[model samples]
Target: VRLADGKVRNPEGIEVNASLQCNMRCQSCAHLSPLYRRENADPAEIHDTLSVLARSYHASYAKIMGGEPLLHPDVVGLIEAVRATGISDTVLVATNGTLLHRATERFWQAVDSLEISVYPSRMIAPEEIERYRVLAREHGVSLLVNYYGHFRAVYSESGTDAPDLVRDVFDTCKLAHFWNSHTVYDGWLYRCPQSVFMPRQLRDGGWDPRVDGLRIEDDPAFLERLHRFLTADDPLRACRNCLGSVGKLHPHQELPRAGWQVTEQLAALVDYPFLKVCKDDITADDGCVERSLSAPVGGA
Candidate 1:
């Protein structure tokens, strides 16, 4: 099924989760798969899905993500399969960076960019940062750091807590291209990755045939609709509540405050050139950033 917003948008890239499993248990991850301890998808399934998306969407760029994509045994194989399709100019990976220390050269060579989440604590150290800086430069891969903002710890009423448990301020004022959230999992497309993190009634399964074998030139409307549905809902209460009280003393002292915001300057930097579709269009500009941060849906 395809959803559209009565406009045309040519997407420059797409993001997919290679697996839902992750090694670190960050408090504010939208998917919260960290606590759920989900299993990774079979390598074969990941390859098959990419093949289908490439053939159907004329996708030019793609992101292979996960709780931690590096955890997959076939990480290298998966990268090769996607590149072989010749549909992507840039194939990026989102990772925690702890595993790159042990990664093979072949793994580094296949990707175009590496987006590393630089958590203040957990899975990263000064040595590790330097290591990736050298490795990324040596391998011709562009590196970008994702600095999370305003985090609060999560505490259970029973006084038990997940170590370093915290809420993230993602919608607050951080700006980066990859920060625009969207996820397609088990055949279901969600508004953003955060949808999976929040408690909602939704199902997975079924593909939209309208998008089948459609090129950006042939059906640009399809892409526009997809973007619209992903950002249609706004001012999510759960997100607002989480961001408002991320770092204050409260009854739930264990739960740390975490929220994200994108500064206007950062938005201009990241969204320029690449996202020109929304350049002259104020509504498009507002929709993209507004939905990203879970801002109030209507009214200027």
Candidate 2:
């Protein structure tokens, strides 16, 4: 669907997990596959599917993600493949950046933006962060620093760190504009990475596990409900018991522990303290964020 600004948008941006395998075993990773188990699409298959999507959707932007895109031996090939379609203008990849330091110049040049996952406490140092920022700037690519909240890593037997150690950097309320985009992991599109990591409801049926993949194609009602839940009038009924705050954390709450934390907070914050009051709300002017929040499922 087209927005007021005439930009074609999808409620949830298309996220391609090129490989569901990561070299890092961070504790908070939802895609931590079982040991010795691996399920990944061939690079050729991924390239073809994405090429089709680019043509069909007139896709101008795509976030190439994974266990880690850089880990793929054909990282440059994948980027070049997407660029070949001529449908993508912005190619964003989320990575740990450890491997990026080793990436070739060609690989770096192909990417329009890099959303580096900077765990302030684990796997990353402040100096490293600055170095990456400088590199991204030099490459003329957009760089976004992501702060992993609630989850941390502590030193382990291997001398490698296990998740769950760092102090929670930003409180729930302080995450008003934390992420600029939303993604659908396993088909369940959520308001933030946290929500996708911690699902609130199953997109399918009783036979399906409560935490199974979110089937956007299978569930026609999901998008509408999400819209009503986000943009409906009657703030008191729609926003009561919400944990989301405008410019500050709600009371003494820390980072959320589950998907409910975000949904409940968003249900409240979307129309009240943020939209209604016009504080530091990112969606105040019917911009991309607001449009995404209110957009019909699949209609981004």
User: Whose lDDT is greatest here?
Assistant: 1
lDDT by residue for model 2 (127-232), tens:
7777777776677777776555433211111110211111111122222133323343443433333333222222221122223233333234544443432232
**Model 1 agreement with the true structure over 49-161: per-residue lDDT tens digits:** 54554443434466788778888877777777666655467788888776777789898888878887655455366676767777777777777755443333211112112
TM-score (C-alpha, index-matched) for candidate 2 = 0.50
At residue 157, candidate 2 shows an lDDT of 14
Candidate 2 clashes between residue pairs 3 or more apart in a chain or in different chains: 9-300, 10-300, 11-300, 152-164, 152-165, 153-164, 153-165
Model 2: lDDT equals 0.43
Model 2 CA deviation exceeding 4 Å by range: 1-8, 28-36, 149-300
Displacement of residue 213 (Cα, Å) in model 1 is 19
User: Which 10-residue window of candidate 1 scores lowest in summed lDDT?
Assistant: 288-297
CA RMSD of all predictions? 12.8, 12.0
